[PDB]
Amino acid sequence: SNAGRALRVLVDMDGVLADFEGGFLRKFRARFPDQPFIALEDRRGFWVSEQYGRLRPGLSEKAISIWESKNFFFELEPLPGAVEAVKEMASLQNTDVFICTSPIKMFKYCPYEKYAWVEKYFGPDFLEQIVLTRDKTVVSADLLIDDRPDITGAEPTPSWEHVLFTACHNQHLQLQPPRRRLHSWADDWKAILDSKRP
Amino acid sequence: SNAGRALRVLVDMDGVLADFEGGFLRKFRARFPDQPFIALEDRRGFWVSEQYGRLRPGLSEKAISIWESKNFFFELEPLPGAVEAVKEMASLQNTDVFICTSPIKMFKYCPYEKYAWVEKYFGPDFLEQIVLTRDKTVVSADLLIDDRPDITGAEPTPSWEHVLFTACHNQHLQLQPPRRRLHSWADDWKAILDSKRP
Numbered sequence: 025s026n027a028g029r030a031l032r033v034l035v036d037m038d039g040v041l042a043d044f045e046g047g048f049l050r051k052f053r054a055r056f057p058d059q060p061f062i063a064l065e066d067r068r069g070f071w072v073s074e075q076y077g078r079l080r081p082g083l084s085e086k087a088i089s090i091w092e093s094k095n096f097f098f099e100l101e102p103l104p105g106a107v108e109a110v111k112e113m114a115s116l117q118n119t120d121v122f123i124c125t126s127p128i129k130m131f132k133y134c135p136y137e138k139y140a141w142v143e144k145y146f147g148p149d150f151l152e153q154i155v156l157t158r159d160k161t162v163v164s165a166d167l168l169i170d171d172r173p174d175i176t177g178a179e180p181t182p183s184w185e186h187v188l189f190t191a192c193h194n195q196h197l198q199l200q201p202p203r204r205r206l207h208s209w210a211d212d213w214k215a216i217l218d219s220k221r222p
Numbered sequence: 223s224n225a226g227r228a229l230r231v232l233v234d235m236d237g238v239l240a241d242f243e244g245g246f247l248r249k250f251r252a253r254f255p256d257q258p259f260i261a262l263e264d265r266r267g268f269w270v271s272e273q274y275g276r277l278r279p280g281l282s283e284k285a286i287s288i289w290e291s292k293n294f295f296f297e298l299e300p301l302p303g304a305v306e307a308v309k310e311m312a313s314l315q316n317t318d319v320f321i322c323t324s325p326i327k328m329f330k331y332c333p334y335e336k337y338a339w340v341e342k343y344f345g346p347d348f349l350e351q352i353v354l355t356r357d358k359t360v361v362s363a364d365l366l367i368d369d370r371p372d373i374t375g376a377e378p379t380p381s382w383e384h385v386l387f388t389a390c391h392n393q394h395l396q397l398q399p400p401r402r403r404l405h406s407w408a409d410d411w412k413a414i415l416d417s418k419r420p
């Protein structure tokens with residue numbers, strides 16, 4: 025809830041609120057049943073298409089066709105606990121929450137579907153909290169909760185502390201102290217927020 | 223062009239790059255030919271529907287229906303000089319340009335059409351520069367060029383200097399020193415940028 029200055033938290037959409045990896049695998053197997061695939065536990069590296077490309081020639085292009093398809097983003101399921109956690113977080117005194125998400129380059133469906141997904145799970149009033157950007161470094165905040173290990177852009181010294189949200193692709197990564205993780209929404213996100221408050 | 227830290231400039235879309243006011247009036251007159259309208263020179267106040275609502279009962283709702291319609295955003299014409307200026311600006315050494323735009327609440331068409339409009343006038347590579355947000359105060363930069371007089375949000379002390387881009391609705395407004403204007407894209411935008419450089 026708005027403040028003074030409230031603590032400001034940026035929450036990533038794909039891989040944090042919306043299950044991109046699981047949605048991808050389900051749709052990939054359904055469309056391409058005779059192709060090999062990567063079980064979620066075996067995912068390595070941020071870029072799904074790069075791992076698929078090494079598995080068999082042509083699979084990178086087939087992987088791409090999944091996320092470029094209509095309804096891919098809209099039909100993603102929420103991660104367990106994500107809706108409940110972010111609704112609670114937004115309701116806290118002196119706490120402003122933004123959903124900070126990078127859309128894919130193919131813009132026909134993705135931006136629209138991300139607004140529609142937020143309306144669906146968080147309601148109309150949460151639409152005011154959406155920031156779409158390919159550069160999260162130019163968005164100022166106290167915290168950024170995001171599954172991508174390397175978050176870079178035009179601002180060499182972002183104001184936020186990046187808290188790494190665990191995903192299968194990043195789960196084995198050793199981080200440089202004092203970088204830290206949110207292991208899932210069942211993990212103690214309120215302690216992380218409280219650590220940044222005056 | 224990217225840097226160190228480049229000077230960072232946020233450029234508004236509606237009323238700065240895209241002619242929202244002219245597009246609105248043209249489509250309003252075409253759809254509602256028997257209703258009274260507001261000539262552009264006579265526009266007062268940021269909110270078009272508020273002025274229309276005072277003109278005749280029911281006109282606020284008719285005005286709204288124009289911007290909620292398919293192709294409203296996509297078919298906006300660029301302001302004179304806007305495309306040329308922003309292409310030149312983005313090409314300058316040590317200068318990063320973002321298009322920082324607030325979409326309307328009705329999300330069916332507007333976000334998509336804004337990406338499509340940028341692709342059309344600036345090309346595919348400029349899509350990486352789009353930031354969609356209802357709160358521009360949480361976007362950090364040196365400058366924000368925007369026709370709205372009152373730009374507020376979660377951050378009480380934005381990093382940018384807001385340069386007021388002239389529109390008929392704001393042209394008579396006296397600003398509190400040291401606030402300043404860009405009167406049109408024919409005006410000396412490079413001098414304003416240079417004033418913020420080290």
Ligand SMILES: O=c1[nH]c(=O)n([C@H]2C[C@H]3O[C@](c4ccccc4)(P(=O)(O)O)OC[C@H]3O2)cc1CSCP(=O)(O)O
Binds near residue numbers: 037038091129130
């Ligand atoms: O975790 C991911 N895993 C993944 O495999 N992809 C695919 C889709 C498509 O996205 C991009 C992408 C790159 C940067 C930002 C967003 C998407 P594309 O738009 O095609 O360039 O990258 C190649 C592809 O890779 C994309 C993501 C990023 S989701 C956005 P955020 O959570 O970082 O906000």
Ligand SMILES: O=c1[nH]c(=O)n([C@H]2C[C@H]3O[C@](c4ccccc4)(P(=O)(O)O)OC[C@H]3O2)cc1CSCP(=O)(O)O
Binds near residue numbers: 271323325356
């Ligand atoms: O200059 C304007 N003149 C104008 O009459 N309108 C209408 C459309 C619709 O937009 C909103 C609007 C409010 C804030 C931000 C963006 C749009 P709505 O989405 O319906 O709440 O406000 C009421 C309506 O008023 C909207 C604008 C803002 S364009 C966005 P930016 O240039 O500030 O980024």
Ligand SMILES: [Mg+2]
Binds near residue numbers: 036037170172
């Ligand atoms: Mg992510």
Ligand SMILES: [Mg+2]
Binds near residue numbers: 238
């Ligand atoms: Mg504007």
